[PDB]
Design a protein around this nucleic acid. Structure first.
Lengths: 116, 134, 42, 129, 196, 152
RNA sequence: AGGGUGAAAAGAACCCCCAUCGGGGAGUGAAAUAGAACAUGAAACCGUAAGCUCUCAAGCAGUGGGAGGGGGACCAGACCC
RNA sequence: CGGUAGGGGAGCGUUCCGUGUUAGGGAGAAACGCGUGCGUGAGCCGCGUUGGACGAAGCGGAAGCGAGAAUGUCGGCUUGA
């Protein structure tokens, strides 16, 4: 019972190639190099999904800081966050920063009535 | 007449897509905040116990807004409770998790489709509390 | 002496296209002569 | 092409092999199978090694005969073709019916090929008896 | 050519107009929600559309650098070029203002920096390192001193070059950008002006 | 559909001629007048031209006989040169080692094209944009409209 | 080392380019996107055509974010380049 | 519930056999190339084009049964040009 391989090889290497078919140069069209590269692509994806969570937060913090410094001359992000928790107020950084963009009136309003 | 007809039939023109109440809120669901406005849908974590078509009220509304917006002193405004309807509980698009280590023959590939839920917001119940906005 | 890798692709295209442009120049010149062939030349 | 593998199978003693066959040349036959079904003709030439007979005027087949010698037109000669014995069958022309052939020993010493269904003899044509 | 060109342009205008009428685009000021209600701007972090940040609409600033601190000024300048100034910040794009510096040759520096500080450029040769002092260079080309201090604080990379151009240093007091009405620059620091 | 009868694919092939040396010549005549092309190919300084010239003239004669349209109308639309069937001689070299030299071949193809077949239809669409003459529900706007197919 | 035109050679009369080779019409055939280098015809490699896009850039070439542009004879906050 | 050597458990496919000269198939099988289905994965499953006759399951069985590395090996085709 001789068993030729035939079908089973490139039916998977097509699927391997389906990933890399946006890649630039040799990486897109060379079997074993595609196989080497796909892995690395997936690894960089998995790695950067966790970088995502901290990096968006880090952007938001900068946005909020930039927004809040335009009020009083000496008022600053660090103080602002502790002033939120002093009054018991569970707005997360995403919302705060995005309202700071899309409706600065509302940040003015939150800033006004947190101080007292 | 004919001039106004055929062209009108072929290339159209758009109307202001709905009435809209235009009064936004900020809800907390799966330990995760969302700006939420009525007549409008959202994706969330799969709500354990929720049916396919089944209306619900979200009682964690940390903010409301309009012409005269209204923050919160504590958490939740007080008796404000957002009114919504569950649509469907389909799974998310596949995220490929891939463990890899260099040279150790340790390639380990594993998909993951997190179950989510689609919900449609019907209306914000009015606040009647702490009017800010100057 | 010897090449370290192959140029492989894209670079070889860039190299060949200039050579084909040599051909283009010759074509222009040969086109110009055909009008000279028509009428006069004494 | 001629095709190299597909030729007369030589025996051990350098001679091609042949098939007994129900049919002979001085014979009228109806076609059972193929494109020309039901048509009634005669056998003319008979290729033994293939089991293929040649019926006169039946396999109507065009041929573009190119001019052999001079600068002239040639012409499209519509010729016959071969046809396999299994497809043809032996017609009576009394009841005008097909058959399946069988042998019998007659009072006249010779052995002959009668039919089934109006079992009438088919053995007094060509060289003859 | 002419016939087919005009006809093509008549179609290009119409197809341009067909899309311009498909979903519309604000500026800043604004209120959270509107009668757009297309893709979710609200639960997806803001990212600027080119329609916003065009180079004409950008603010301007002027710094008179006389009797100042070189580094302390430069940090604020860098900030105001980046856009960390503005709430609408984005690391990937420049949404920051311009800066104009005047009396760059009268900028001040603490300690014994007027002699001891060296500015080095290396030609790119086996010999040529050329090293000259703060004051020696200031006598010749004072523009650099501010310019060099600023470029060191801007993010080096494809963007770093583009948004460097926005700095405009000058030798003297007067500047040729009266057309733009460049306003005065705000200055977070106590040490920023020199003791005198 | 947009053409189909605006052409005749004469494909003279197995020409004993390297593909790159054929692409020197054929890259110049991709989209020219046929008259002009012939004037070029006889004066050009290349071995490459002769078999190309033969195929251009054969293609144009073919077009004039078979489909019966004017040689003064037509142009060279798609010229294309592909790899043929390679032959391999094994030549000797110094010191006993041996290397191959190849006799390369080619497959040349030329698609000619009449300018003015679908001109009656195209010149009629000098009619300016907001027109939509809705006669047969949509009808025959099938003649290289060229600029857009924005028909949503 | 070098098998597989078709069921049947029906293997292309005639016309055109033309010294040949070969090609396009015609004709045969179920099919000639089966023409003898002929059956299914993958990859590398070589092109041709269309959509976007690089000439102050620095790059194991991907990945997360995504400006601006383009769609698919099927009206999507959806999807693809 | 990190994991190299390494041990244990649970699977997917490959060709062939029993069931089966099964139904499914010249109103289109095997193949070949594409999928805005599915699965933890190996893989599965529907599609109408090219293709022109083979041949799924399910329950079982057996191996010339899975490849990227061997200065592997045979064939093709590059680079240097």
């Amino acid at each position: 019972t001789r068993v030729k391989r035939g079908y089973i090889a490139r039916r998977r290497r097509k699927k391997i190639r389906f990933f890399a078919s946006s890649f630039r140069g040799a990486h897109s069209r060379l079997t074993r190099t595609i196989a080497q590269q796909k892995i690395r692509a997936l690894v960089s994806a998995h790695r950067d999904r966790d970088r995502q969570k901290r990096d968006f937060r880090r952007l938001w913090i900068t946005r909020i800081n930039a927004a809040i410094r335009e009020r009083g001359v000496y008022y600053n992000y660090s103080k602002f966050i502790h002033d939120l928790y002093k009054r018991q107020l569970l707005l997360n950084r995403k919302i705060l920063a995005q309202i700071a963009i899309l409706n600065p009136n509302c940040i003015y309003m939150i800033y006004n009535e947190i101080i007292k | 007449p004919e001039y106004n007809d055929i062209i009108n039939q072929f290339l159209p023109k758009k109307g202001p897509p709905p009435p809209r109440e235009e009064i936004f809120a900020v809800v907390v669901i799966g330990s995760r905040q969302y700006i939420v406005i009525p007549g409008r849908w959202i994706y969330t974590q799969r709500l354990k116990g929720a049916t396919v078509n089944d209306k619900i009220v979200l009682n964690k509304v940390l903010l409301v807004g309009t012409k005269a917006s209204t923050y919160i002193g504590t958490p939740i405004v007080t008796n404000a409770a957002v009114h919504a309807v569950v649509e469907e509980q389909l799974l998310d698009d596949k995220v490929i998790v891939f463990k890899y280590k260099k040279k150790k023959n340790y390639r380990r590939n594993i998909g993951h489709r997190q179950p989510i839920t689609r919900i449609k917001i019907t209306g914000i119940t009015g606040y009647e509390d702490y009017p800010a906005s100057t | 002496a010897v090449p370290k890798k192959r140029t492989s692709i894209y670079k070889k295209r860039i190299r060949k296209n200039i050579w084909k442009k040599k051909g283009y120049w010759a074509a222009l010149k040969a086109f110009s002569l055909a009008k000279s062939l028509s009428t006069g030349n004494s | 092409r001629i095709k190299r593998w597909e030729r007369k199978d030589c025996k051990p003693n350098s001679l091609p092999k042949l098939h007994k066959r129900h049919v002979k040349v001085g014979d009228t036959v109806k076609v059972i199978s193929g494109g020309e079904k039901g048509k009634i003709g005669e056998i003319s030439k008979i290729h033994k090694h293939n089991s293929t007979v040649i019926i006169k005027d039946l396999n109507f087949k065009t041929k573009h005969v190119k001019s052999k010698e001079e600068g002239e037109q040639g012409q499209i000669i519509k010729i016959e073709a071969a046809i396999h014995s299994s497809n043809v069958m032996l017609i009576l022309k009394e009841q005008e019916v097909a058959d399946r052939v069988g042998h019998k020993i007659l009072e006249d010493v010779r052995k002959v090929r009668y039919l089934i269904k109006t079992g009438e003899i088919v053995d007094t044509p060509d060289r003859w008896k | 050519t002419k016939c087919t060109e005009e006809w093509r342009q008549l179609k290009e205008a119409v197809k341009k107009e067909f899309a311009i009428p498909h979903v519309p685009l604000d500026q800043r000021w604004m209120f959270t929600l509107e009668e757009a209600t297309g893709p979710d701007i609200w639960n997806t972090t803001w990212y600027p559309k080119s329609a916003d940040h065009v180079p004409t609409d950008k603010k301007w600033y002027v710094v008179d650098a006389t009797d100042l601190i070189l580094g302390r000024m430069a940090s604020t300048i860098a900030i105001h070029i980046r856009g960390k100034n503005l709430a609408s910040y984005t690391p990937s794009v420049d949404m920051g203002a311009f800066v104009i510096v005047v009396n760059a040759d009268k900028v001040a520096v603490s300690g014994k920096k007027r002699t001891q500080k060296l500015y080095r450029r290396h030609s790119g040769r086996p010999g040529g390192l050329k090293e000259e002092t703060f004051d020696q260079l200031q006598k010749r080309i004072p523009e650099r001193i501010i310019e060099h201090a600023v470029r060191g604080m801007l993010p080096k990379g494809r963007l770093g070059r583009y948004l460097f151009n926005h700095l405009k240093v000058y030798k003297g007091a007067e500047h040729p950008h009266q057309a733009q009405q460049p306003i005065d620059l705000p200055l977070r620091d106590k040490r920023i002006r020199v003791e005198k | 559909e947009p053409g189909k009868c605006d052409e005749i694919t004469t494909r003279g092939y197995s020409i004993s001629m390297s593909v790159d040396k054929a692409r020197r010549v054929i890259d110049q005549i991709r989209g020219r007048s046929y008259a002009e092309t012939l004037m070029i190919l006889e004066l050009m300084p290349y071995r490459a031209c002769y078999p190309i010239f033969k195929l251009i003239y054969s293609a144009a004669a073919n077009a004039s006989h078979n489909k019966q349209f004017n040689k003064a109308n037509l142009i060279i639309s798609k010229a294309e040169v592909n790899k043929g069937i390679t032959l391999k001689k094994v030549k000797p070299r110094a010191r006993g080692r041996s290397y191959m030299i190849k006799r390369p071949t080619c497959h040349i193809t030329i698609v000619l094209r009449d300018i003015t077949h679908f001109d009656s239809y195209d010149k009629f669409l000098e009619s300016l944009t907001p027109k939509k003459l809705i006669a047969l529900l949509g009808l025959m706007s099938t003649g290289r409209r060229r600029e857009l197919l924005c028909g949503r």
